[PDB]
């Protein structure tokens, strides 16, 4: 009684397809020019910190420790904002370093110094290396990829699960000695919403890597950024590695690009004391240290680690209706059919969607002609290459509601037909 | 009658008084700081409306974009615009980056070494030696970036009208020498400006390397002493003209302008140097900081506001390097034991001491409670072969403060003078 797409009849399935390619038609008559692809905030979300391009003030250019801002020097980033991500995260203060408004940055440095001078741990640098392997939970982030792309390692991909990498592949990879890092996102990750559990945490911080300069790049990009009123846990995975007597393994990052400002937020690096003392001994070389005045202009604007949650039920609220109207058409749409698996997150800025396999590129092209742009099948996978050619990645945050209702149904049309293309 | 021709008895007797005044000048349990090239608290006051830029509600770059918002490799055209028409440049030249030159400076290098440059056959971690050239006295922390990357440094002297030309075309004949330093304009921390025409031989000669690189910091573009502003050369521009084009990395920055370490930074270079740039940029993140670029071009307004702020940093600077010079010549030029530079700009004077005797000069220094900084600060590795050679900073400190320390400092300089000669 119940049937899906995948089994329909041969001729029902080619009704199936006649139908929809009506309602696809219809689609396409609409003339759209809609847009999935942004993972930013809104203006509306960007509105919240409009005092912030007014602070710290004139006259108010004192840190905590009596440092004067707009003066060099200071490598570490200022007490004042430090203490507040102490606080927040739930870490010592000691752990953290503020750098400027790019985390990005930060991994890219961390991993170009590797490969350059070797870290802390290495006995030479990556570059004397004939392999250098990385590991890439997917689906993941782009930008992480196109890091490890550019420098040329080997990509290997790991399921991203429900509660973090697949820790028994993981466990075997890094037997390895090409194997030198990986990425995960560990709270609402890029874009699964997937987070990392303390047992998969104890896991990552107890195996026993090849490589005696292993680093697990532990990019919390979504760490306070909740849709509902319960904030997750911030597991202190670099005091997890210093349990485990593998101290040095995390180089853990998090920033405000998603809480204040895009792009001209303030960045954080937590990671161990034999690990920050390298970071700053090269960080010493490439200059005088980071913007102290917009460290200090974010302490101003939140105050303490309550104000930063403040702004995230400000941020939860404004999203909230977005994610929620992209899940209700998918599920008003697909539901019945049995085609899509998709993600329902409860944080972060994506739904990942699972199409029929084979069918992805598809579903990206047959909306392109309806006028609704979706990012490129493979967009979450190393090289760009989903070996299944089934994930797509949708961006709620940027549209307003009554544009997210459009586009969904088209893309839950283009779909079906690509589907019933597949089937028939 | 100079130090250097009194006769045994009379230097004695020289070295008798003037250890006297040491210990005198050592007991008044002096702490002062004659090192830090920073600006002084009553010049980065006249930046402190820029604490409160843009400000709420003021967001748009004049194209329109959103500043609050991802996206941008290359900087607003707001502050491109603006820097391309106090230096002279076409604004296609410019790229506005974050609050720090020497960030970018290294990433050059950084991204030379692991990937080449676009002009490189191989990256430069693949040659067994690379040399560079560094010409003296010179900025340790341009010489710090390319010690750390193990860059064999090679001397050149920084003369009155830039780096010995004859030396610098000999050696880049060397296919192992694959750039330079060069501060062309009030040089740190000579104060000499490369001329017209050192700046043509820079820009027509041949080098061995095909990916050779100038690094053209030119960190004191507009920061006169005496309100007249000096030439500046279209560097990337000579280099086209040469049939060279890519051969120059320009640098600037508002570190000494607005807020030092809360500024904006420029890298202006030729189209396939900023192509080659970006690409690497946009794997490295999403782009530099717009808010910042926008605080500071509402804050100029245009080229006539940025040189009117560096008016107020002349008036400010002025007469704590003529307090400097009144010293060193009521102390000092009657002894013919010192000569120092005489600078139209910049942050410095350089201080040439008796030979063999720099390195017991700010030692002196330090024991009687005034930091300098060390011998051979200026030169690779901190090594100055003659060890005559000192830096002084006027910039920071009060002229009271200046007035003190350089009795001082002059008082250990014929200390140190007369422990030679005796
Ligand atoms: C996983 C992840 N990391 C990092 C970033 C970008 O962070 P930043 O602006 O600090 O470079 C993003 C985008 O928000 C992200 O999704
Ligand atoms: C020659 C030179 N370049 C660069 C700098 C530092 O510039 P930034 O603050 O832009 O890194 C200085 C200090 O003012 C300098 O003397």
Redesign the interface.
Known sequence: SSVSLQDFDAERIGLFHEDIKRKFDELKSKNLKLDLTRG??S?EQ?DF???L?????????KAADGT??????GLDGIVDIRQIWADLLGVPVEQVLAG???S??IM??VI?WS??FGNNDSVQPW?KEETVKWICPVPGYD?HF??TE??GFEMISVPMNEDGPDMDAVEELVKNPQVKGMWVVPVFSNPTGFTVTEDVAKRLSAMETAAPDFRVVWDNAYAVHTLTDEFPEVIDIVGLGEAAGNPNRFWAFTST?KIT????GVSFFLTSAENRKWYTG?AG??????????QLAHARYFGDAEGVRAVMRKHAASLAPKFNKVLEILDSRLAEYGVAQWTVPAGGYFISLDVVPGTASRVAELAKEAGIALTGAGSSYPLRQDPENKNLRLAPSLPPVEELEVAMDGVATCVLLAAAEHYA
């Open positions: 930013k905030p203006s960007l910190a409009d005092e391009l007014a602070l710290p003030g004139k006259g108010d250019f004067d801002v707009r003066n060099y020097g400027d408004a790019s990005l940055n890219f440095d170009s490969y350059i570059s930008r196109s890091i550019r420098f690009s400002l895009a792009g001209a090269h070389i490439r200059g005088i240290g980071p913007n102290k005045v917009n």
